[PDB]
Design a protein around this nucleic acid. Structure first.
Length: 91
RNA sequence: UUGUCCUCCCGGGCAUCGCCGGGCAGCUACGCCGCAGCCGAUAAGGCCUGAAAGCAUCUAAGGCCGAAGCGGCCCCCGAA
Protein backbone atom coordinates (compact mmCIF):
# COMPACT_ATOMS: atom_id res chain seq x y z
CA UNK A 1 0.00 0.00 0.00
CA UNK A 2 1.26 3.46 -0.98
CA UNK A 3 -1.30 5.31 1.18
CA UNK A 4 -4.19 4.76 3.56
CA UNK A 5 -6.67 5.71 0.84
CA UNK A 6 -6.94 7.53 -2.48
CA UNK A 7 -9.71 10.06 -3.14
CA UNK A 8 -10.13 11.82 -6.49
CA UNK A 9 -12.68 14.59 -7.07
CA UNK A 10 -14.12 15.86 -10.36
CA UNK A 11 -16.04 19.14 -10.20
CA UNK A 12 -19.51 19.20 -11.78
CA UNK A 13 -20.46 22.43 -13.62
CA UNK A 14 -23.90 23.93 -13.13
CA UNK A 15 -25.26 22.80 -16.50
CA UNK A 16 -24.02 19.21 -16.11
CA UNK A 17 -25.84 16.38 -14.33
CA UNK A 18 -24.01 13.23 -13.20
CA UNK A 19 -25.55 10.00 -11.91
CA UNK A 20 -24.00 6.74 -10.72
CA UNK A 21 -26.05 3.53 -10.95
CA UNK A 22 -23.60 0.98 -9.58
CA UNK A 23 -20.39 0.94 -11.62
CA UNK A 24 -21.94 2.77 -14.60
CA UNK A 25 -21.57 6.57 -14.66
CA UNK A 26 -24.06 8.57 -16.73
CA UNK A 27 -23.33 12.19 -17.65
CA UNK A 28 -26.13 14.31 -19.11
CA UNK A 29 -25.76 17.85 -20.41
CA UNK A 30 -27.15 20.37 -22.89
CA UNK A 31 -25.31 18.85 -25.87
CA UNK A 32 -26.12 15.18 -25.26
CA UNK A 33 -25.85 12.27 -22.86
CA UNK A 34 -23.21 9.57 -22.35
CA UNK A 35 -22.74 6.49 -20.19
CA UNK A 36 -19.65 4.44 -19.38
CA UNK A 37 -18.94 1.46 -17.13
CA UNK A 38 -15.96 2.19 -14.86
CA UNK A 39 -15.05 -0.99 -12.97
CA UNK A 40 -12.02 -1.94 -10.90
CA UNK A 41 -12.02 -4.14 -7.77
CA UNK A 42 -12.09 -2.08 -4.59
CA UNK A 43 -12.77 1.26 -6.33
CA UNK A 44 -16.03 3.02 -5.47
CA UNK A 45 -17.50 5.85 -7.56
CA UNK A 46 -20.19 8.11 -6.11
CA UNK A 47 -21.30 11.75 -5.91
CA UNK A 48 -20.94 14.29 -3.10
CA UNK A 49 -22.21 17.87 -3.24
CA UNK A 50 -21.03 19.05 -6.66
CA UNK A 51 -18.26 16.51 -7.25
CA UNK A 52 -17.82 12.97 -8.50
CA UNK A 53 -15.65 11.01 -6.06
CA UNK A 54 -13.51 8.01 -7.00
CA UNK A 55 -12.31 6.42 -3.77
CA UNK A 56 -10.32 3.38 -2.68
CA UNK A 57 -8.85 2.06 0.56
CA UNK A 58 -5.15 1.18 0.78
CA UNK A 59 -4.40 1.55 -2.95
CA UNK A 60 -1.34 0.26 -4.76
CA UNK A 61 0.53 1.73 -7.74
CA UNK A 62 -1.84 0.19 -10.29
CA UNK A 63 -4.86 1.20 -8.20
CA UNK A 64 -3.72 4.84 -8.11
CA UNK A 65 -3.07 4.80 -11.86
CA UNK A 66 -6.51 3.33 -12.55
CA UNK A 67 -8.21 5.88 -10.29
CA UNK A 68 -6.47 8.78 -12.04
CA UNK A 69 -7.39 7.33 -15.44
CA UNK A 70 -11.04 7.08 -14.38
CA UNK A 71 -10.98 10.68 -13.15
CA UNK A 72 -9.53 11.82 -16.48
CA UNK A 73 -12.15 9.85 -18.43
CA UNK A 74 -15.00 11.34 -16.39
CA UNK A 75 -13.60 14.84 -16.88
CA UNK A 76 -13.42 14.15 -20.62
CA UNK A 77 -17.06 13.04 -20.56
CA UNK A 78 -18.06 16.27 -18.80
CA UNK A 79 -16.09 18.40 -21.26
CA UNK A 80 -17.61 16.59 -24.23
CA UNK A 81 -21.18 16.96 -22.99
CA UNK A 82 -20.49 20.64 -22.18
CA UNK A 83 -18.64 21.97 -25.25
CA UNK A 84 -17.76 18.99 -27.46
CA UNK A 85 -14.65 17.99 -29.36
CA UNK A 86 -13.33 19.13 -32.74
CA UNK A 87 -10.51 17.46 -34.69
CA UNK A 88 -8.75 18.94 -37.72
CA UNK A 89 -7.13 17.15 -40.66
CA UNK A 90 -5.32 18.43 -43.75
CA UNK A 91 -5.07 16.83 -47.20
C1' U B 1 -3.85 -63.73 -98.14
C1' U B 2 0.75 -67.81 -97.17
C1' G B 3 1.75 -73.44 -96.00
C1' U B 4 -0.79 -77.68 -95.22
C1' C B 5 -5.21 -81.28 -94.53
C1' C B 6 -10.59 -82.41 -95.36
C1' U B 7 -10.44 -85.39 -103.36
C1' C B 8 -11.36 -80.49 -106.70
C1' C B 9 -15.83 -76.14 -106.43
C1' C B 10 -18.42 -73.67 -102.10
C1' G B 11 -17.41 -74.26 -96.67
C1' G B 12 -14.05 -75.52 -92.75
C1' G B 13 -9.41 -77.31 -88.89
C1' C B 14 -4.22 -76.02 -87.47
C1' A B 15 -0.04 -72.83 -87.94
C1' U B 16 0.69 -66.51 -81.61
C1' C B 17 -6.26 -64.37 -83.14
C1' G B 18 -1.53 -68.23 -88.66
C1' C B 19 -0.16 -62.99 -90.73
C1' C B 20 -2.24 -58.40 -92.42
C1' G B 21 -6.12 -53.83 -92.85
C1' G B 22 -10.68 -51.78 -90.78
C1' G B 23 -13.64 -52.20 -86.51
C1' C B 24 -19.44 -50.53 -83.17
C1' A B 25 -20.66 -51.53 -77.58
C1' G B 26 -17.30 -51.68 -73.23
C1' C B 27 -12.59 -49.67 -70.72
C1' U B 28 -9.63 -45.91 -71.49
C1' A B 29 -6.36 -40.30 -72.06
C1' C B 30 -3.13 -38.41 -75.49
C1' G B 31 -9.72 -36.46 -75.26
C1' C B 32 -13.87 -33.47 -72.77
C1' C B 33 -16.61 -31.03 -68.45
C1' G B 34 -16.45 -28.81 -62.91
C1' C B 35 -13.36 -26.68 -58.46
C1' A B 36 -16.47 -19.48 -53.48
C1' G B 37 -14.26 -15.37 -52.28
C1' C B 38 -17.38 -13.46 -48.42
C1' C B 39 -18.16 -13.12 -43.15
C1' G B 40 -15.88 -13.67 -37.47
C1' A B 41 -11.80 -13.38 -34.18
C1' U B 42 -6.47 -12.93 -34.32
C1' A B 43 -0.28 -13.18 -34.90
C1' A B 44 3.63 -9.62 -36.76
C1' G B 45 2.52 -4.70 -37.58
C1' G B 46 -0.44 0.55 -37.77
C1' C B 47 -3.51 3.65 -34.59
C1' C B 48 -7.34 6.13 -30.79
C1' U B 49 -8.36 7.60 -25.38
C1' G B 50 -5.25 7.70 -20.84
C1' A B 51 -2.42 7.70 -16.01
C1' A B 52 1.31 5.89 -13.27
C1' A B 53 5.32 10.13 -13.85
C1' G B 54 0.13 17.58 -13.16
C1' C B 55 3.91 17.00 -19.31
C1' A B 56 4.86 13.15 -22.82
C1' U B 57 3.39 8.33 -23.96
C1' C B 58 -0.24 2.48 -28.70
C1' U B 59 -0.66 -0.06 -22.53
C1' A B 60 -0.87 -0.51 -17.26
C1' A B 61 -7.28 -0.46 -17.40
C1' G B 62 -9.97 0.29 -22.24
C1' G B 63 -11.21 0.69 -27.89
C1' C B 64 -10.36 0.32 -33.76
C1' C B 65 -8.26 -1.76 -37.81
C1' G B 66 -4.90 -5.73 -39.51
C1' A B 67 -2.12 -12.18 -42.67
C1' A B 68 -2.00 -17.70 -48.51
C1' G B 69 -2.32 -18.60 -41.27
C1' C B 70 -7.40 -20.08 -37.44
C1' G B 71 -13.37 -20.93 -37.15
C1' G B 72 -17.80 -20.98 -40.80
C1' C B 73 -20.22 -20.91 -45.34
C1' C B 74 -18.86 -25.57 -49.29
C1' C B 75 -17.65 -31.12 -50.51
C1' C B 76 -17.26 -36.49 -48.51
C1' C B 77 -18.39 -40.53 -44.11
C1' G B 78 -21.95 -40.20 -40.48
C1' A B 79 -27.91 -43.46 -35.30
C1' A B 80 -22.96 -47.69 -31.67
Amino acid sequence: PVDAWIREEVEIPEGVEVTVEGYKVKVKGPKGELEREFFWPGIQIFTEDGNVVIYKDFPRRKDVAIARTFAAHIRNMIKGVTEGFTYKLKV
